[PDB]
Design a protein around this ligand. Structure first.
Ligand SMILES: [Mg+2]
Length: 1260
RNA sequence: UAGGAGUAUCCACCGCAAGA
RNA sequence: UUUUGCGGAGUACUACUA
C-alpha cells in the first residue's frame, strides 16, 4: 500500500541564474536556424541539388513502368454481363488468333487464345456458370478458369513461363531531354484521358453538381476507362481466389477490344502473393504507355498493344478497384474548393483535366510517387511561409531516385510550382498544381496537394525492406545515447548537468541531455499556475484508479496486442492483453490494485517490440508493443500526469479529440484580440508602437528518440499537487525510474531476414552490434513513442512558460504576448512584438541608450524582436531534450498550422478528404447493416468537418453503390432482395438488404438506420389504417430479425473470420461450468467483476464468446473486402448456426413472414418501440420534411469558418448476492460552420440546408 | 527485370505418385 | 533442373480522445 520511497530533494536553483545566463546568451550574435524564402534562393537550391544528384545514383537510359493496368478505350463502355462476356471473348480470341506473335509474351497470349477458342462446348457451358451449375469437364476445373498444360505451349511461351518462375538507378533529371520526354508522354496520357467519347436535396444536386460536374465527366474517356478498370479488377479479384489462382483464364470487355489474360499465380489470400496478368488492347486514346508496352502487334489498320506481365499485390488491386470512385471523390472535393475560392463554377476544361490527373494518380499506385507527394505536402507550407527550413526539405526531395517517367513529370511540376510560389511572396495568388487557374486562398492549394496525396493507399512499402527501417531510428539514437554516456559520464547524463556546467561547456545544451536547474525552474513556473487550482488537482488525481482493482477496466482487458514472455528462442512472444490478464490472474491469489501490481512487478525489466503502423508517409513509423509490467508503470505515470494535464490550459493532448479545434481557435482569437491597439513604452512620456503577431508552426525533431526520460523525474519531484503527503508523487517517481531502461527486441521478420542475409555488408553489422545476443538490446533514456504522450506535452508547456517568465524578466519595459499550444511533438507558438512607427528613430535611440546603460542583451531587440524571441525559446527548450526541427517548422505572419489543420486568422480549414476517401477503402465486415452504417457514418463526419451537402451526398451514393456491389445487394445480382422477398427492394429491412440510399440530411440529423426505422413506422401505419397483408408481411421480417456496429434489430454474423485454433485459456473451464455460472450471476454481463475467481470466470467466458473471438482473428483490413467480393455468390449467411448462402436466409424470412400472424404482445412491443425510443429521431425527420427552401439572388461569398458543438444501475436491478452488491456499488460531435452560424442544435441543421447551393444563397 | 520494392541481399507457392 | 496425374495454401495491427 504505497510503499515508502526516497523521492528526490529540490536543488533550489534561482530563476535569476537563468536570467543572467540568458542575458549573456543574448549579448552575442546568434545565427538564425531558418532561411528566408526567396525565388532566387529556391532556384539556387533546386539548381545545386539537380547538379549534385547525378553523382549519387547510377545513370539509367530506360525509364521504368509506372502504370499498373494499361488499357485503351475508343467507344462507350457498358458494364460487363456474363452474356456480354462470352461473345466478347469469342470475338477477342478470333482477333488475337488472326494476329502474329512477336515476343514471348505475345506467344503466350496467342497460345492462351488458341486454347480458349478450342475449348469444347461443354466447358463453355460450365464456364461462365455459378457453382451450382458447374461440373468438372477435364478442361475447366473452376467456374471461370481453364487449364493450359506446358505441352499445350510453344517454345517461346514456356520460355516466358521460365522467366516468370525463375543496383538502383535514377533517370538523369538534370538533363533537358529526359524532362521533355517525360512531360510530352504524360501530357499525351492526360490529353487522351480528357477526350470525349462518342426533394430539395435532389433538386439542388441536379441543379448545381450533377449539371456542372457529373454531366461534364460522363463524356470523358477517363470515366469509361475507370469503369473498364473496375471491371478488370473485379475479374482479377474473382480469379484470385484460393481455388481459382491455380489455373489460367481469359476475359474480354468492350466488344472484344480489351482482353485480360490471367496467368497462374499465388492466391491473394496468402501473404506475399501477386496476381500475374497480361492485357491486350487496340492502340488508341487511353492509359497507354507505348514505351513500356511488351509488344505492339500490327494488323491491317490495327495496332494491338500487349502490356508486360504485370504482378499486382492485393493492396494495389483493391486500390485500382475503387480508382474511379476515388478520382470522382477527389474531383468533387476540388470542385467544391474551387467554388468556395473563386465564387464561380469551374470551366469545362479545368474540371476535365483535374479529373484526368486524379484518375491517373489513382491508377499509378507506386511508393515513389507517394513519397514525392508526402514531401510536397510539407514543401508547400515551407515556401509560402515567411521563414522556413526549405533547403533541408528540398534536399530530402532530391534524396530519392527518379526511376520512373511519372516521377520526372511530377518533379518538374513541383519545381515550377515552388519557384512560382516563392517568387510571389508578400488574398494573394497561389497557382494550382494540376490546373492552370490560380487560387486566392492558400487553403485551396494545400488542399489540392493534400487531396492528391491521399489518393495513394496505405502500406505501399516493401514488406521486408521497411521492416528493417523502423528499427534504425531507435537503434541509432540508442547508440548516440551510449556515446553520450561514455563521453560525458553516466551520472551526468541520467541526472542532468547543472547550470554552471553548461556555462563552462556551452556545448552541453544538446538533445538527450537536460539541465537540472531548467527542469526545476519549469516545474516552478507550472506550480505558479497550479497553486490556484491545487484543490482541483488533488480531486482529479484522487479520481484516478489508484485504489480500484486492476484488470477491471476496459484498457487492462481488451483485444489490443501485448508482448508476452521471452520464448525459448529468445524473441518476445506476442499475445492479446486479455490473455496476459488471465494468465496473471490464474497465477495470483487475488485481484491486485494498480499500486499493489506495481509493487509486485517493479523489479521486472521493461521490454518492447516495434511493429509497422502501415502509414502512407515517405518512411513508415513503428509503434511499440510493451509487456505487462511496462504497461502498469506507463499507466501509473500517464494517469498521474493526465490528472494534472486536464487542469491547465495550453495543454491540448489532454483535451478531447474534438475540443482541440475549439480551444486552439479560442487561443488564436485571444491573440488577435491582443493585436488590436497600440503599446506605449516609457522613455523615462511614451513612444507608440504597433502590435504585430507572428505564428510559428513548430514540430520537434525527435520526440521519443532524441529524449531523456529521466528529465520527468526531477520534474515530478517538483510538480505541486493538492495531496497532503508526497507518497503518490514518490510512487510516480519510482515508476519513472523503472521505465528508464527498456529491452528493445528485434522483430521476428527482421531476425529471419538478417539470418538469411548470407553477406553482412556494412551498415548492417553496425545495426546488429546493438543486439549482443542477437535478439534484444538495452535502450536507455528513450521512452517508447506513444507512451508518456501527456507527460511530455506537460513538460513542453512547462518549458514554454519558463521561457515566457525569462523573457518577461529580461525586458520588463516591453509588453509582449505569448500564446503556446503543445500537442506532443506538434506545437504552435504565437509571439507578439512591437514594431515601431515612422522608422522608430526614437526606438533606435532608446535601444542605444539602454545598451549604453549597461544592458548588453538589448542587441537582440532593435530590429525583428520575434527572431530573438524564437532564438531564446528554442534555446530554453533545448535546455530540456526538446529540439525544434529546422526542417518542418514554418514562421508566418498570417497563416499557421496545428494538429494537421490550417488556420488563416480565425478561419480553420479541416481537410475532409481524409474522411471521405476513408469511407471507401475499408469496412468492419460485421454485417451488411454494420458495413452500410460504417460507410454512411464516415460521410456524416465529413459533413461535420466541412464537406458540402452535395459532395457528401455524392460520396454517400458512391459508398452505397460500392457496398451493394460488394455484398451483391444491388439489383441484378445474386443477393437481390426483390427476387426472394416479395418487395419492391425499397421496403426491405436494411439488415436483409434493400435500398440503403438515403438523404444525407436524414443521416446527419435523424440517424443512420433511420430508413429501417421509417419502414417499421410506415408498416405499422399500414397495419393501423388498411390492415394490408404487405404491411403485415413487412412486420414478419422484423420479428424474424429479432429471433435471429450499431445496436438495433439486425440479422448474427456476416463476418466469416473464425479462428484457426483455440486460444490459450479458452478451455480453462468446461462449457457447462460457464453456462451454469452465467445464469447464477446474471448481472456480470453488464459490469466487470472485482473478485479474482469471478473475474477469471468472466474473462474465460469472454474468451469463449464467438463475438469476441471473431474480432481477435481479424487483424489485416481489406482481406474481408477481397473475401466478400470473391464469394458474395455463396458460403455465408449464419442461418440457424450454419454457413449457407444468404438466399436461404431470404427464403426463410419469406416463409416466416408469410406464416406469421399478429399477436397482442408483438404488436404492442412494436408500437412502444417505434413511439418511445425514436421519439427524437422521428421529430428530426419531421423537422426536415417541415422545412422549405427558396433561392434569392446573391452570390455566396464564404466567410471565416468556425467550429461548434452538436448537442451501472442495471446491475443493481438483477443483483442478488452481497459480492454482486459490492461490485455494482463500486462500479457506480464538433462541426465546422460559417461565422454567422451559432451553436444551437438546430442552427447547424439550418446552415446545412442553407449551404445546399454552392453559388446561390438560399433562405430557410 | 516480366512485375512490386529498393542506394537492406526480399517477394514473386506447397506436398505425393508416376515417367526421363 | 523438368513432364503428366492429383491434392491443397484464410491474411503482426500499440497507450491517445471524444
Ligand atoms: Mg505542426
Amino acid at each position: 500500500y504505497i510503499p515508502d520511497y526516497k523521492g528526490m530533494e529540490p536543488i533550489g536553483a534561482n530563476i535569476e541564474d537563468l536570467v543572467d545566463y540568458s542575458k549573456d546568451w543574448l549579448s552575442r550574435a546568434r545565427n538564425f536556424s531558418f532561411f528566408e524564402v526567396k525565388g532566387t534562393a529556391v532556384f539556387e537550391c533546386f539548381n545545386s541539388n539537380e547538379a549534385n544528384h547525378c553523382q549519387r545514383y547510377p545513370m539509367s537510359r530506360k525509364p521504368r513502368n509506372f502504370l499498373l493496368i494499361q488499357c485503351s478505350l475508343i467507344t462507350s463502355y457498358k458494364p460487363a454481363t456474363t452474356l456480354s462476356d462470352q461473345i466478347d471473348s469469342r470475338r477477342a480470341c478470333s482477333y488475337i488468333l488472326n494476329l502474329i506473335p512477336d515476343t514471348p509474351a505475345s506467344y503466350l497470349i496467342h497460345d492462351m487464345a488458341y486454347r480458349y477458342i478450342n475449348l469444347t462446348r461443354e466447358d463453355m457451358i460450365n464456364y461462365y456458370a455459378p457453382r451450382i451449375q458447374f461440373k468438372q469437364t477435364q478442361n475447366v476445373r473452376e467456374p471461370g478458369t481453364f487449364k493450359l498444360t506446358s505441352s499445350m505451349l510453344r517454345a517461346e511461351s514456356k520460355a516466358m513461363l521460365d522467366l516468370l518462375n525463375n543496383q538502383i538507378e535514377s533517370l538523369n533529371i538534370a538533363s533537358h531531354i529526359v524532362q521533355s520526354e517525360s512531360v510530352s508522354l504524360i501530357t499525351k496520357i492526360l490529353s487522351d484521358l480528357e477526350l470525349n467519347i462518342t426533394t430539395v436535396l435532389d433538386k439542388f444536386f441536379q441543379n448545381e453538381t450533377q449539371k456542372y460536374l457529373i454531366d461534364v465527366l460522363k463524356k470523358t474517356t477517363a470515366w469509361h476507362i475507370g469503369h473498364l478498370i473496375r471491371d478488370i479488377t473485379e475479374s482479377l479479384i474473382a480469379h484470385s481466389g484460393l481455388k481459382r489462382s491455380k489455373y489460367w483464364s481469359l476475359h474480354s470487355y468492350n466488344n472484344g477490344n480489351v482482353i485480360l489474360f490471367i496467368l497462374p499465380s499465388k492466391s491473394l489470400e496468402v501473404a506475399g502473393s501477386f496476381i500475374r496478368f497480361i492485357t491486350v488492347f487496340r492502340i488508341g486514346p487511353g492509359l497507354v504507355d507505348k514505351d513500356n508496352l511488351d509488344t505492339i502487334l500490327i494488323d491491317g489498320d490495327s495496332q494491338w498493344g500487349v502490356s508486360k506481365v504485370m504482378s499486382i499485390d492485393l493492396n494495389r488491386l483493391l486500390a485500382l478497384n475503387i480508382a474511379f470512385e476515388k478520382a470522382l471523390i477527389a474531383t468533387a472535393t476540388w470542385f467544391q474548393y474551387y467554388t468556395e475560392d473563386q465564387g464561380q463554377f469551374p470551366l469545362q476544361y479545368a474540371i476535365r483535366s483535374v479529373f484526368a490527373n486524379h484518375f491517373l494518380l489513382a491508377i499509378c499506385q507506386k511508393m515513389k510517387l507517394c513519397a514525392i507527394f508526402d514531401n510536397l505536402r510539407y514543401l508547400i507550407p515551407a515556401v509560402t511561409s515567411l521563414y522556413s527550413g526549405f533547403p533541408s526539405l528540398i534536399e530530402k526531395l532530391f534524396e530519392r531516385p527518379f526511376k520512373s517517367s511519372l516521377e520526372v513529370y511530377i518533379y518538374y511540376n513541383i519545381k515550377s510550382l515552388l519557384v512560382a510560389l516563392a517568387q510571389n511572396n508578400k488574398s494573394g495568388v497561389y497557382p494550382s498544381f494540376m490546373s492552370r487557374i490560380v487560387y486566392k486562398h492558400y487553403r485551396s492549394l494545400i488542399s489540392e496537394v493534400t487531396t492528391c496525396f491521399f489518393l495513394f493507399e496505405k502500406g505501399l512499402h516493401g514488406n521486408m525492406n521497411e521492416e528493417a527501417k523502423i528499427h534504425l531510428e531507435t537503434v541509432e539514437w540508442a547508440l548516440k545515447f551510449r556515446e553520450k554516456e561514455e563521453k560525458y559520464g553516466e551520472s551526468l547524463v541520467e541526472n542532468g548537468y547543472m547550470m554552471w556546467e553548461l556555462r563552462a561547456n556551452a556545448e552541453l545544451a544538446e538533445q538527450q541531455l537536460y539541465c537540472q536547474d531548467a527542469i526545476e525552474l519549469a516545474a516552478i513556473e507550472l506550480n505558479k499556475v497550479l497553486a490556484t487550482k491545487s484543490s482541483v488537482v488533488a480531486n482529479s488525481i484522487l479520481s484516478k484508479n489508484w485504489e480500484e482493482p486492476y484488470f477491471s477496466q476496459t484498457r487492462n482487458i481488451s483485444l489490443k496486442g501485448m508482448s508476452g514472455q521471452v520464448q525459448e528462442d529468445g524473441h518476445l512472444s506476442s499475445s492479446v492483453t486479455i490473455i496476459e490478464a488471465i494468465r496473471y490472474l490464474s497465477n495470483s491469489r487475488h485481484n491486485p490494485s494498480l499500486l499493489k501490481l506495481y509493487e509486485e512487478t517493479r523489479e521486472q525489466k521493461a521490454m518492447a517490440r516495434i511493429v509497422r503502423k502501415y502509414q502512407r508517409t515517405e518512411a513508415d513509423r513503428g509503434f511499440f508493443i510493451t509487456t505487462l509490467p511496462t504497461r502498469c508503470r506507463l499507466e501509473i505515470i500517464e494517469d498521474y500526469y493526465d490528472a494534472i494535464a486536464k487542469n491547465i490550459s495550453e495543454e491540448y493532448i489532454s483535451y478531447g479529440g474534438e475540443k482541440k479545434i475549439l480551444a486552439i481557435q479560442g487561443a488564436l482569437e485571444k491573440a488577435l484580440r491582443w493585436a488590436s491597439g497600440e503599446s506605449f513604452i516609457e522613455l523615462s512620456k511614451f513612444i507608440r508602437m504597433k502590435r504585430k503577431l507572428m505564428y510559428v508552426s513548430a514540430d520537434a525533431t525527435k520526440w521519443s528518440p532524441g529524449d531523456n526520460s529521466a528529465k520527468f523525474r526531477r520534474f515530478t519531484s517538483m510538480l505541486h499537487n493538492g495531496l497532503p503527503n508526497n507518497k503518490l508523487k514518490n510512487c510516480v517517481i519510482d515508476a519513472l525510474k523503472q521505465v528508464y531502461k527498456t529491452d528493445f527486441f528485434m522483430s521476428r521478420k527482421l531476425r529471419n531476414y538478417i539470418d538469411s542475409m548470407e553477406s553482412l555488408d556494412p551498415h548492417i553489422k553496425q545495426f546488429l552490434d546493438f543486439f549482443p545476443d542477437g535478439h534484444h538490446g538495452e535502450v536507455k533514456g528513450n521512452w517508447l513513442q506513444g507512451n508518456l504522450n501527456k507527460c511530455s506535452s506537460l513538460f513542453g508547456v512547462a518549458m514554454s512558460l519558463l521561457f515566457k517568465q525569462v523573457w518577461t524578466n529580461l525586458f520588463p519595459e516591453l509588453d509582449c504576448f505569448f500564446e503556446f499550444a503543445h500537442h506532443s511533438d506538434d506545437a504552435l507558438f504565437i509571439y507578439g512584438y512591437l514594431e515601431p512607427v515612422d522608422d522608430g528613430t526614437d526606438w533606435f535611440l532608446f535601444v542605444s541608450q539602454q545598451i549604453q546603460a549597461g544592458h548588453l542583451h538589448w542587441f537582440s531587440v532593435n530590429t525583428e524582436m520575434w527572431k530573438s524571441m524564437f532564438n531564446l525559446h528554442e534555446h530554453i527548450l533545448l535546455l530540456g531534450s526538446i529540439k525544434i526541427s529546422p526542417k518542418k517548422t514554418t514562421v508566418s505572419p498570417t497563416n499557421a498550422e496545428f494538429l494537421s489543420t490550417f488556420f488563416e486568422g480565425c478561419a480553420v480549414s479541416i481537410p475532409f478528404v481524409k474522411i471521405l476517401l476513408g469511407s471507401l477503402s475499408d469496412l468492419p465486415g460485421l454485417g451488411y447493416f454494420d458495413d452500410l452504417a460504417a460507410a454512411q457514418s464516415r460521410c456524416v463526419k465529413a459533413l461535420d468537418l466541412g464537406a458540402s451537402p452535395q459532395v457528401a451526398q455524392l460520396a454517400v451514393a458512391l459508398c452505397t453503390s460500392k457496398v451493394e456491389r460488394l455484398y451483391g445487394t444491388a439489383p441484378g445480382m445474386v443477393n437481390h432482395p426483390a427476387a426472394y422477398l416479395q418487395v419492391k427492394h425499397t421496403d426491405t429491412p436494411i439488415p436483409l438488404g434493400g435500398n440503403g440510399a438515403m438523404s444525407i440530411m436524414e443521416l446527419a440529423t435523424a440517424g443512420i438506420g433511420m430508413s429501417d426505422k421509417n419502414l417499421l413506422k410506415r408498416a405499422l401505419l399500414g397495419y393501423s389504417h388498411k390492415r394490408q397483408k404487405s404491411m403485415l408481411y413487412i412486420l414478419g421480417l422484423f420479428k424474424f430479425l429479432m429471433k435471429l456496429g450499431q445496436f438495433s434489430f439486425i440479422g448474427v454474423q456476416w463476418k466469416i473470420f473464425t479462428p484457426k485454433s483455440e486460444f490459450e485459456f479458452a478451455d480453462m473451464y468446461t462449457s457447462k461450468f460457464l453456462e451454469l455460472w452465467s445464469s447464477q450471476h446474471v448481472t456480470y454481463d453488464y459490469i466487470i467483476p472485482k473478485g479474482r475467481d469471478n473475474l477469471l470466470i468472466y474473462l474465460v467466458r469472454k474468451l469463449n464468446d464467438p463475438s469476441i473471438v471473431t474480432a481477435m482473428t481479424m487483424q489485416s483490413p481489406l482481406q474481408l473486402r477481397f473475401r466478400m467480393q470473391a464469394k458474395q455468390h455463396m458460403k455465408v449467411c449464419r442461418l440457424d448456426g450454419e454457413w449457407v448462402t444468404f438466399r436461404e436466409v431470404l427464403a426463410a424470412a419469406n416463409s416466416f413472414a408469410e406464416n406469421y400472424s399478429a399477436t397482442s404482445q408483438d404488436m404492442d412491443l412494436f408500437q412502444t418501440l417505434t413511439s418511445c425510443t425514436f421519439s427524437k429521431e422521428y421529430a428530426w425527420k419531421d423537422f426536415l420534411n417541415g422545412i422549405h427552401c427558396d433561392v434569392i439572388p446573391t452570390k455566396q461569398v464564404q466567410r471565416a469558418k468556425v467550429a461548434r458543438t452538436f448537442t451501472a444501475v442495471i446491475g443493481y436491478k438483477f443483483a442478488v448476492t452481497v459480492e454482486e452488491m459490492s461490485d455494482v456499488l463500486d462500479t457506480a460531435r464538433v462541426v465546422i460552420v460559417q461565422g454567422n452560424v451559432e451553436g444551437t442544435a438546430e442552427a447547424i441543421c439550418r446552415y446545412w440546408l442553407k449551404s445546399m447551393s454552392l453559388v446561390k444563397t438560399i433562405r430557410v
